[PDB]
Amino acid sequence: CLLLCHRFPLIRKTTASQVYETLLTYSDVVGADVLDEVVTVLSDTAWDAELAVVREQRNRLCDLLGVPRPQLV
Amino acid sequence: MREIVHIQAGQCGNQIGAKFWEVISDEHGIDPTGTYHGDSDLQLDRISVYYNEATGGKYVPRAILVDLEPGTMDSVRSGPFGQIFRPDNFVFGQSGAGNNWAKGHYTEGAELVDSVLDVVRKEAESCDCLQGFQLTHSLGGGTGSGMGTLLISKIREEYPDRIMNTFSVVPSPKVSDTVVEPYNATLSVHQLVENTDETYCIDNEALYDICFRTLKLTTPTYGDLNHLVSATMSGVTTCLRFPGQLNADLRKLAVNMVPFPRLHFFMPGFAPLTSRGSQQYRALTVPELTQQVFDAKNMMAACDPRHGRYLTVAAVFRGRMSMKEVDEQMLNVQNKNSSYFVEWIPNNVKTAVCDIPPRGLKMAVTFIGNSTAIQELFKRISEQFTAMFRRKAFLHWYTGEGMDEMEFTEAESNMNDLVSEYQQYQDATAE
Amino acid sequence: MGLLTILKKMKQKERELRLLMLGLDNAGKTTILKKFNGEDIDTISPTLGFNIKTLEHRGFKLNIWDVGGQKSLRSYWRNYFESTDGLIWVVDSADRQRMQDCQRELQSLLVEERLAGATLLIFANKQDLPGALSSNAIREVLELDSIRSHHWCIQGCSAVTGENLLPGIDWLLDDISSRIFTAD
Ligand SMILES: Nc1nc2c(ncn2[C@@H]2O[C@H](COP(=O)(O)OP(=O)(O)OP(=O)(O)O)[C@@H](O)[C@H]2O)c(=O)[nH]1
Numbered sequence A: 001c002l003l004l005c006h007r008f009p010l011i012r013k014t015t016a017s018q019v020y021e022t023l024l025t026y027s028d029v030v031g032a033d034v035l036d037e038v039v040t041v042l043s044d045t046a047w048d049a050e051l052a053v054v055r056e057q058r059n060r061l062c063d064l065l066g067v068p069r070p071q072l073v
Numbered sequence B: 001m002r003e004i005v006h007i008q009a010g011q012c013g014n015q016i017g018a019k020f021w022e023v024i025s026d027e028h029g030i031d032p033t034g035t036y037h038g039d040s041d042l043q044l045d046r047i048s049v050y051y052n053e054a055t056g057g058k059y060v061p062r063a064i065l066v067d068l069e070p071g072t073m074d075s076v077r078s079g080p081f082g083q084i085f086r087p088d089n090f091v092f093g094q095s096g097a098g099n100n101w102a103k104g105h106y107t108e109g110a111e112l113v114d115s116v117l118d119v120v121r122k123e124a125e126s127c128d129c130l131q132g133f134q135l136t137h138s139l140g141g142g143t144g145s146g147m148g149t150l151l152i153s154k155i156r157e158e159y160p161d162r163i164m165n166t167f168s169v170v171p172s173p174k175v176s177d178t179v180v181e182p183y184n185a186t187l188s189v190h191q192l193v194e195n196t197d198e199t200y201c202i203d204n205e206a207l208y209d210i211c212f213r214t215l216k217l218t219t220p221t222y223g224d225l226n227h228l229v230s231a232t233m234s235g236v237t238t239c240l241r242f243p244g245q246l247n248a249d250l251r252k253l254a255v256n257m258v259p260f261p262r263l264h265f266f267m268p269g270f271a272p273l274t275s276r277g278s279q280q281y282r283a284l285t286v287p288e289l290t291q292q293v294f295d296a297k298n299m300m301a302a303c304d305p306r307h308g309r310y311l312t313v314a315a316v317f318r319g320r321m322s323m324k325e326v327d328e329q330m331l332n333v334q335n336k337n338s339s340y341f342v343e344w345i346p347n348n349v350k351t352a353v354c355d356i357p358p359r360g361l362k363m364a365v366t367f368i369g370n371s372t373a374i375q376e377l378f379k380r381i382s383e384q385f386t387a388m389f390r391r392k393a394f395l396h397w398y399t400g401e402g403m404d405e406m407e408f409t410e411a412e413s414n415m416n417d418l419v420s421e422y423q424q425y426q427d428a429t430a431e
Numbered sequence C: 001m002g003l004l005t006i007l008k009k010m011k012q013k014e015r016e017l018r019l020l021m022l023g024l025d026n027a028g029k030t031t032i033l034k035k036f037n038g039e040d041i042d043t044i045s046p047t048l049g050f051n052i053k054t055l056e057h058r059g060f061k062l063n064i065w066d067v068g069g070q071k072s073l074r075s076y077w078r079n080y081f082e083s084t085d086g087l088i089w090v091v092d093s094a095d096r097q098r099m100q101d102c103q104r105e106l107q108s109l110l111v112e113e114r115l116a117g118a119t120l121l122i123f124a125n126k127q128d129l130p131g132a133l134s135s136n137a138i139r140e141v142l143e144l145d146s147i148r149s150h151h152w153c154i155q156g157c158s159a160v161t162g163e164n165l166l167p168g169i170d171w172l173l174d175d176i177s178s179r180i181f182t183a184d
């Protein structure tokens, strides 16, 4: 999740694609009633766009996967 | 006037040269009769490079046709643009070679080399300022493999202050089922490593895989590959026939692109890849064409440059575009802060813009690079070379003519040394 | 074109050939030469060294290359100006000790190739004497079933009722003329 919002948009896109591939590979990570919303959110999100627009979406995924929101000064 | 003499060897070489001349004649504006009919002044400012001036404003093509078999000679002469060629440059034999390097280099190949030199010597005497030569052939048969290297060494000696560039064709088992082919190919490489300034490797396996996947062809014939070969050759020789901001010739290009004399194998490319059909999809933009010409899918060789290190890169654009847009693109893409940043595209790229677009395409980009990925092809060839030298199969065919067994071991050692040098030079940084 | 084309044209016009004759029995070669020339002693007996003679038979310019030794014969097999078209080897029937060397020389000389090659003619002189081998024994000893690209033929001869030798010599000429030259 920390790499999902990197300074380079290509790194963000690569991390998003790799996370999507790993979620499609392993099925014992996220539950059945949670993985659907995660896949729907990860697919309908342009990670190569305004960081303010993208960030809001990443905080969402964290809250959907039980992860504390990392913040900076 | 920096004139360049062109030589054609073998059936493949003759066909490729004929198609290249056919392509460049329609671009320069020359009718089958021999006169000029273009509507631009930029089509004649460099016509003295590949043509000669005659009486009545004629432009004779500067190419020589040589073979040990006449079938190809008759096929071309009677072609659409065969009447413009000089009949004195037709030197052919009868028997041939039969896929044997010895029969084409020491036996029947040496009984015609002197006759070939006659035409060359005589053609180079009328040139006011000769720059170099050129040769198009293939590394599969016996004629273009043995007689080709022989003529190359002849030019190297008689003329050691000139330039030598070849457009070899790498054979593939998916097309030809010949068995000794690999040996002949090695014997040619053993001489091309030492007596060549620049080489453009055109892998037939890569073209077959492209025609059998991207273009989707049930049975890709020879013309389907020859079209792409001629298109790539017309895309590369644009700086030598049309001026621009990147003022260079053959000597400057060989100095800038070839830093080491032993490392000079390039990998060409062209985008977009179209078949022989007279159709078109949509006018692609500059970034799309750049991404297509820089991708490993549009590579003429079966080698991935992503696994290697780029040495010298040079791209040539053709279309109604401006240099400012190309500069802005090359400056924006190489920025990691942008969203359209890519890693599979190098940074040191020499850009060039041409006004005249290719025949049938409004915008097209040509890729020329010196990636260290030819070691994969050299290992694929060495695999076949070692999988047949252990059993000594078909080795008596060469020794029964006058060849020595030490030549094969010397060629294998040279190939191994070249592969090791490429592997050593692949890892290089500068901080 | 060149010197090779002119040489081939001259060979096809004058019908010139080159028959490399080998052997060491120094007894079976006389009749062979007598078949090439009406003479009986002059240019009929084999020489110890190496002699080149030219005779005319059936309108064919035969260039017999009589070699006495039977070692390192690859020097006479090939030539920068002319190749070998026929090969005639004369051995002894009642001699099983000097046959292995001849078999090894024939195996090292004749090799496999793409198209056809020279024609072989194995001669077996002195068959009426006790101890002579038949055609099957000679074929099994020399191992002629593994020799391809060269048509071979065993022709027997004897001092008495030797079944002559006309077909053995006629087949060689019929196979040579129908290979390089054209019938019509
Ligand atoms: N791309 C391409 N390859 C060709 C073409 N014609 C032949 N080849 C390839 O060239 C190799 C055979 O070499 P040839 O052109 O037949 O050589 P040659 O020197 O004329 O032949 P010989 O004198 O018989 O030895 C094989 O790998 C063929 O697939 C052609 O038009 N295009």
Ligand SMILES: [Mg+2]
Binding pocket: B010, B011, B069, B096, B141, B143
């Ligand atoms: Mg050929």
